[PDB]
Scaffold this motif. Structure first.
Motif, PDB file in Angstrom:
ATOM      1  N   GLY A   1       0.816  -1.210  -0.032  1.00 43.55           N
ATOM      2  CA  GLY A   1      -0.061  -0.096  -0.129  1.00 43.55           C
ATOM      3  C   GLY A   1       0.854   1.320   0.088  1.00 43.55           C
ATOM      4  O   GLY A   1       0.171   2.349  -0.149  1.00 43.55           O
ATOM      5  N   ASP A   2       2.209   0.978   0.207  1.00 42.80           N
ATOM      6  CA  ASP A   2       3.096   2.304   0.230  1.00 42.80           C
ATOM      7  C   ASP A   2       2.913   3.047  -1.122  1.00 42.80           C
ATOM      8  O   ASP A   2       3.175   4.006  -1.159  1.00 42.80           O
ATOM      9  CB  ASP A   2       4.297   2.018   0.701  1.00 42.80           C
ATOM     10  CG  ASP A   2       5.199   3.221   0.820  1.00 42.80           C
ATOM     11  OD1 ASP A   2       4.986   3.985   1.785  1.00 42.80           O
ATOM     12  OD2 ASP A   2       6.077   3.603  -0.041  1.00 42.80           O
TER      13      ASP A   2
ATOM     14  N   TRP B   1      -8.477  -7.116   1.178  1.00 47.16           N
ATOM     15  CA  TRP B   1      -7.838  -5.770   1.201  1.00 47.16           C
ATOM     16  C   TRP B   1      -6.347  -5.671   0.488  1.00 47.16           C
ATOM     17  O   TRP B   1      -5.982  -5.033  -0.125  1.00 47.16           O
ATOM     18  CB  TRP B   1      -7.901  -5.243   2.654  1.00 47.16           C
ATOM     19  CG  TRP B   1      -7.436  -3.880   2.794  1.00 47.16           C
ATOM     20  CD1 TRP B   1      -7.590  -2.639   2.298  1.00 47.16           C
ATOM     21  CD2 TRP B   1      -6.093  -3.654   3.337  1.00 47.16           C
ATOM     22  NE1 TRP B   1      -6.629  -1.781   2.631  1.00 47.16           N
ATOM     23  CE2 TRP B   1      -5.668  -2.424   3.382  1.00 47.16           C
ATOM     24  CE3 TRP B   1      -5.000  -4.685   3.939  1.00 47.16           C
ATOM     25  CZ2 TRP B   1      -4.320  -2.034   3.878  1.00 47.16           C
ATOM     26  CZ3 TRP B   1      -3.963  -4.091   4.612  1.00 47.16           C
ATOM     27  CH2 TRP B   1      -3.600  -2.660   4.482  1.00 47.16           C
TER      28      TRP B   1
ATOM     29  N   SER C   1      -6.170  -5.912  -2.933  1.00 50.50           N
ATOM     30  CA  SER C   1      -6.897  -4.960  -3.419  1.00 50.50           C
ATOM     31  C   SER C   1      -5.396  -3.830  -3.672  1.00 50.50           C
ATOM     32  O   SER C   1      -5.312  -3.091  -4.625  1.00 50.50           O
ATOM     33  CB  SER C   1      -8.087  -4.114  -2.874  1.00 50.50           C
ATOM     34  OG  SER C   1      -7.689  -3.570  -1.719  1.00 50.50           O
ATOM     35  N   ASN C   2      -4.596  -3.911  -2.870  1.00 53.69           N
ATOM     36  CA  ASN C   2      -3.314  -3.000  -2.718  1.00 53.69           C
ATOM     37  C   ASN C   2      -2.264  -3.574  -3.565  1.00 53.69           C
ATOM     38  O   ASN C   2      -1.622  -2.733  -4.382  1.00 53.69           O
ATOM     39  CB  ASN C   2      -2.711  -3.095  -1.243  1.00 53.69           C
ATOM     40  CG  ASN C   2      -3.394  -1.992  -0.364  1.00 53.69           C
ATOM     41  OD1 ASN C   2      -4.080  -1.318  -0.740  1.00 53.69           O
ATOM     42  ND2 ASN C   2      -2.700  -1.723   0.843  1.00 53.69           N
TER      43      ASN C   2
ATOM     44  N   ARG D   1      -3.361  -1.713  -6.614  1.00 58.37           N
ATOM     45  CA  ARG D   1      -3.767  -0.247  -6.574  1.00 58.37           C
ATOM     46  C   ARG D   1      -2.345   0.266  -7.258  1.00 58.37           C
ATOM     47  O   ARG D   1      -1.043  -0.064  -7.407  1.00 58.37           O
ATOM     48  CB  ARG D   1      -3.668  -0.135  -5.024  1.00 58.37           C
ATOM     49  CG  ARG D   1      -4.073   1.033  -4.801  1.00 58.37           C
ATOM     50  CD  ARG D   1      -4.299   1.386  -3.212  1.00 58.37           C
ATOM     51  NE  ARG D   1      -5.018   2.721  -2.818  1.00 58.37           N
ATOM     52  CZ  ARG D   1      -5.665   2.678  -1.724  1.00 58.37           C
ATOM     53  NH1 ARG D   1      -5.883   1.370  -0.945  1.00 58.37           N
ATOM     54  NH2 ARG D   1      -6.325   3.562  -1.471  1.00 58.37           N
TER      55      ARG D   1
ATOM     56  N   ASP E   1     -14.111  -3.930  -1.056  1.00 58.28           N
ATOM     57  CA  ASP E   1     -12.602  -4.025  -1.365  1.00 58.28           C
ATOM     58  C   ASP E   1     -12.293  -4.524  -2.812  1.00 58.28           C
ATOM     59  O   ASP E   1     -11.540  -4.287  -3.269  1.00 58.28           O
ATOM     60  CB  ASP E   1     -11.686  -4.612  -0.189  1.00 58.28           C
ATOM     61  CG  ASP E   1     -11.554  -3.555   0.663  1.00 58.28           C
ATOM     62  OD1 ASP E   1     -11.602  -2.446   0.716  1.00 58.28           O
ATOM     63  OD2 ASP E   1     -11.507  -3.937   2.078  1.00 58.28           O
TER      64      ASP E   1
ATOM     65  N   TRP F   1     -13.077  -1.917  -5.040  1.00 66.70           N
ATOM     66  CA  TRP F   1     -11.819  -0.969  -5.136  1.00 66.70           C
ATOM     67  C   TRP F   1     -10.978  -1.359  -6.045  1.00 66.70           C
ATOM     68  O   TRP F   1     -10.480  -0.843  -6.728  1.00 66.70           O
ATOM     69  CB  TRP F   1     -11.482  -0.779  -3.780  1.00 66.70           C
ATOM     70  CG  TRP F   1     -12.151   0.327  -3.252  1.00 66.70           C
ATOM     71  CD1 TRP F   1     -12.955   0.121  -1.884  1.00 66.70           C
ATOM     72  CD2 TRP F   1     -12.325   1.789  -3.531  1.00 66.70           C
ATOM     73  NE1 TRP F   1     -13.633   1.360  -1.492  1.00 66.70           N
ATOM     74  CE2 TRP F   1     -13.497   2.212  -2.436  1.00 66.70           C
ATOM     75  CE3 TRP F   1     -11.832   2.421  -4.504  1.00 66.70           C
ATOM     76  CZ2 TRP F   1     -13.543   3.620  -2.494  1.00 66.70           C
ATOM     77  CZ3 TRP F   1     -12.306   3.737  -4.280  1.00 66.70           C
ATOM     78  CH2 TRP F   1     -13.129   4.353  -3.781  1.00 66.70           C
TER      79      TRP F   1
ATOM     80  N   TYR G   1      -9.270   0.111  -9.486  1.00 66.45           N
ATOM     81  CA  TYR G   1      -7.811   0.539  -9.660  1.00 66.45           C
ATOM     82  C   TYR G   1      -7.590  -0.153 -11.009  1.00 66.45           C
ATOM     83  O   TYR G   1      -6.607   0.518 -11.824  1.00 66.45           O
ATOM     84  CB  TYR G   1      -6.888  -0.044  -8.632  1.00 66.45           C
ATOM     85  CG  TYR G   1      -7.392   0.032  -7.042  1.00 66.45           C
ATOM     86  CD1 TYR G   1      -7.923   1.441  -6.827  1.00 66.45           C
ATOM     87  CD2 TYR G   1      -7.151  -0.684  -6.192  1.00 66.45           C
ATOM     88  CE1 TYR G   1      -8.120   1.817  -5.528  1.00 66.45           C
ATOM     89  CE2 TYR G   1      -7.561  -0.340  -4.784  1.00 66.45           C
ATOM     90  CZ  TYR G   1      -7.880   0.840  -4.609  1.00 66.45           C
ATOM     91  OH  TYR G   1      -8.255   1.195  -3.000  1.00 66.45           O
TER      92      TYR G   1
ATOM     93  N   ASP H   1      -8.573   1.686 -13.968  1.00 67.57           N
ATOM     94  CA  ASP H   1      -8.111   3.228 -14.063  1.00 67.57           C
ATOM     95  C   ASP H   1      -6.829   3.341 -15.103  1.00 67.57           C
ATOM     96  O   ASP H   1      -5.497   3.298 -14.422  1.00 67.57           O
ATOM     97  CB  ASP H   1      -7.846   3.634 -12.786  1.00 67.57           C
ATOM     98  CG  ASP H   1      -7.386   5.159 -12.387  1.00 67.57           C
ATOM     99  OD1 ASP H   1      -7.169   5.795 -13.597  1.00 67.57           O
ATOM    100  OD2 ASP H   1      -7.334   5.670 -11.384  1.00 67.57           O
TER     101      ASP H   1
ATOM    102  N   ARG I   1     -17.022   3.919  -9.400  1.00 68.76           N
ATOM    103  CA  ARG I   1     -15.803   4.358  -9.939  1.00 68.76           C
ATOM    104  C   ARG I   1     -15.227   3.353 -10.969  1.00 68.76           C
ATOM    105  O   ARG I   1     -14.853   3.960 -12.056  1.00 68.76           O
ATOM    106  CB  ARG I   1     -14.949   4.503  -8.638  1.00 68.76           C
ATOM    107  CG  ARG I   1     -13.333   4.829  -9.425  1.00 68.76           C
ATOM    108  CD  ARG I   1     -13.303   6.072 -10.353  1.00 68.76           C
ATOM    109  NE  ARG I   1     -12.910   7.450 -10.043  1.00 68.76           N
ATOM    110  CZ  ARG I   1     -13.158   8.189  -8.963  1.00 68.76           C
ATOM    111  NH1 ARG I   1     -13.669   7.433  -7.774  1.00 68.76           N
ATOM    112  NH2 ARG I   1     -12.498   9.215  -8.449  1.00 68.76           N
TER     113      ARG I   1
ATOM    114  N   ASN J   1     -14.844   4.270 -14.820  1.00 66.67           N
ATOM    115  CA  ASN J   1     -13.606   4.073 -15.412  1.00 66.67           C
ATOM    116  C   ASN J   1     -13.778   3.320 -16.832  1.00 66.67           C
ATOM    117  O   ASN J   1     -13.031   3.519 -17.939  1.00 66.67           O
ATOM    118  CB  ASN J   1     -12.668   3.718 -14.628  1.00 66.67           C
ATOM    119  CG  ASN J   1     -11.839   4.425 -13.383  1.00 66.67           C
ATOM    120  OD1 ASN J   1     -12.017   5.689 -13.480  1.00 66.67           O
ATOM    121  ND2 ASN J   1     -11.422   3.709 -12.612  1.00 66.67           N
TER     122      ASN J   1
ATOM    123  N   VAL K   1     -16.317   3.358 -18.835  1.00 63.99           N
ATOM    124  CA  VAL K   1     -16.799   4.003 -19.978  1.00 63.99           C
ATOM    125  C   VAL K   1     -15.842   5.080 -20.110  1.00 63.99           C
ATOM    126  O   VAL K   1     -16.331   5.871 -21.396  1.00 63.99           O
ATOM    127  CB  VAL K   1     -18.258   4.556 -19.610  1.00 63.99           C
ATOM    128  CG1 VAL K   1     -19.232   3.421 -19.054  1.00 63.99           C
ATOM    129  CG2 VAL K   1     -18.083   5.435 -18.669  1.00 63.99           C
ATOM    130  N   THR K   2     -14.653   5.090 -19.876  1.00 68.43           N
ATOM    131  CA  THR K   2     -13.730   6.023 -20.519  1.00 68.43           C
ATOM    132  C   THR K   2     -12.943   5.317 -21.492  1.00 68.43           C
ATOM    133  O   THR K   2     -12.161   5.991 -22.421  1.00 68.43           O
ATOM    134  CB  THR K   2     -12.450   6.567 -19.460  1.00 68.43           C
ATOM    135  OG1 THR K   2     -11.694   5.354 -18.995  1.00 68.43           O
ATOM    136  CG2 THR K   2     -13.155   7.208 -18.237  1.00 68.43           C
ATOM    137  N   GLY K   3     -13.277   4.119 -21.789  1.00 68.44           N
ATOM    138  CA  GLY K   3     -12.710   3.316 -22.855  1.00 68.44           C
ATOM    139  C   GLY K   3     -13.212   3.345 -24.188  1.00 68.44           C
ATOM    140  O   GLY K   3     -13.906   4.471 -24.375  1.00 68.44           O
TER     141      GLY K   3
END
Lengths: 424, 16
Positions: free
Chosen positions: A119-120, A159, A162-163, A166, A198, A201, A205, A208, A243, A247, A249-251
């Protein structure tokens, strides 16, 4: 082991006595788990990280493995410099090794620690991947029914995964994403609200990014499940689902069509009136990218009754949402047929469009002026530029367009001189 | 071409 000084902790950890070391490590875990200002830097400066890392390898003493895993998790939960201290101590491979522990509480703590490290940012995320975290993480989820896993345990695993999905610059390695995706698809169908949040999420990611990344997700067939989750009552699920959908539908127009085909537009009456400002904003942004599509997709927005909702948001919403609505209108009028544009005017778009020209934001002004020009162009094909001019004058719009001739920004005053000179 | 790219999940968590 309550409220030891760091000095006492160091004394116990340096004793040659495993039980003294255990008690001191537990004392460190308790200090590091306190609500106000855990003394992470004092613990680092005392040189304790390497000792904690060596205790992770004490297979013969599972309690000191657990206490040290918890202490290091909490150091890794801090600033980038604090997480770095943990990585620099060799924690990554030691935590990966503990994923195989037969003690579920220790395995779980290693999952948690790796989540904080990943996650850093992208570099540590990628370093965790290079040390081989993904295979053993996924193995913990290879069971016939996720419901047999302890709920906290499954939430932590979701979680952490998910990281691993990310962050960008760079995005995660393509092969890692392909490895994780089938497990994520399965988690998206689990019935626990935190796992679903998560998982969404994670998908947000992964989507995006450029169309190639979006395609990897879309081809796994998850869009219909995302659309179902978009309709959840829980905001923590709706937010990432929306989200992710935004994302996608930006394609490409084809990727956007999968969102439409899955029934997403039927949820938008509610999203576009959602009492959470950020949901309305993201929903309107999503609509703006749909109205940027093909005429048959604009037609779906029309058929679902969404034009009145866009007029609504343009009339009254937080300013950032109003700005997305303005974009949705300019995109619609840019790509729409004459008939679609006429319909927009009949839904009452003109007055709230004109009202926003008082905005202290030069970008939304450019956008609105563009939309007005587009609408006039449709009006020309119908030989009805006069009716539209009167409409704009009647609601106080002409007053605003003429004032914009005296506008600082060069683009505004040119766009508006043009409107005045041609139609007024 | 006319497409515009862009309550969070925390990136790190302390166990209390």
């Amino acid at each position: 082991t309550v409220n030891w000084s760091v000095e006492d902790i160091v004394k116990g950890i340096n004793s040659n006595n495993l039980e003294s070391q255990l008690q001191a490590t537990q004392a460190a875990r308790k200090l590091l788990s306190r609500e106000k200002q855990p003394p992470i830097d004092n613990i680092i400066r005392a040189g304790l990280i390497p000792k904690f890392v060596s205790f992770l390898g004490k297979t013969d003493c599972s309690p000191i493995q657990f206490e040290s895993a918890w202490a290091l998790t909490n150091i890794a939960s801090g600033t980038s410099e604090q997480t770095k201290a943990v990585v620099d101590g060799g924690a990554i491979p030691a935590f990966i090794s503990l994923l195989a522990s037969p003690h579920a509480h220790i395995s779980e703590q290693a999952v948690w620690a790796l989540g904080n490290i990943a996650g850093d940012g992208s570099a540590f995320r990628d370093l965790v991947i290079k040390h081989g975290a993904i295979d053993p993480l996924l193995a913990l989820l290879a069971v016939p029914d996720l419901s047999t896993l302890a709920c906290g345990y499954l939430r932590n695993l979701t979680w952490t995964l998910s990281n691993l999905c990310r962050n960008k610059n760079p995005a995660p390695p393509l092969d890692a994403v392909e490895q994780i995706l089938p497990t994520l698809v399965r988690l998206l169908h689990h019935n626990d609200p935190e796992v679903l949040a998560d998982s969404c999420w994670a998908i947000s990611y992964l989507t995006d990014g450029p169309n190639e990344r979006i395609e990897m997700v879309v081809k796994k067939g998850v869009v219909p499940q995302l659309v179902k989750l978009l309709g959840a009552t829980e905001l923590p699920i709706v937010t990432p689902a929306l989200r992710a959908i935004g994302n996608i539908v930006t394609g490409t127009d084809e990727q956007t069509q999968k969102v439409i085909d899955a029934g997403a537009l039927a949820v938008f009456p509610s999203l576009l009136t959602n009492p959470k400002t950020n949901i309305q904003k993201e929903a309107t942004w999503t609509m703006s990218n749909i109205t940027a599509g093909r005429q048959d997709q604009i037609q779906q927005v029309v058929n679902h009754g969404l034009v009145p909702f866009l007029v609504g948001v343009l009339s009254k919403a937080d300013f950032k949402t109003q700005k997305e609505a303005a974009w949705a209108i300019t995109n619609y009028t840019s790509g729409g047929t004459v008939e679609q544009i006429v319909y927009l005017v009949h839904c009452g778009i003109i007055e709230p469009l004109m009202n926003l020209l008082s905005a202290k934001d030069t970008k939304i002004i450019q956008v609105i002026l563009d939309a007005i020009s587009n609408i006039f162009q449709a009006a020309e094909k119908l030989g009805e530029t006069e009716k539209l001019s009167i409409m704009i004058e009647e609601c106080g719009g002409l007053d605003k367009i003429e004032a914009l001739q005296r506008h600082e920004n060069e683009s505004v005053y040119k766009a508006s001189l043009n409107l005045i000179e041609k139609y007024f | 071409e006319s497409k515009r790219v862009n309550d969070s999940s925390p990136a790190k968590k302390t166990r209390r």
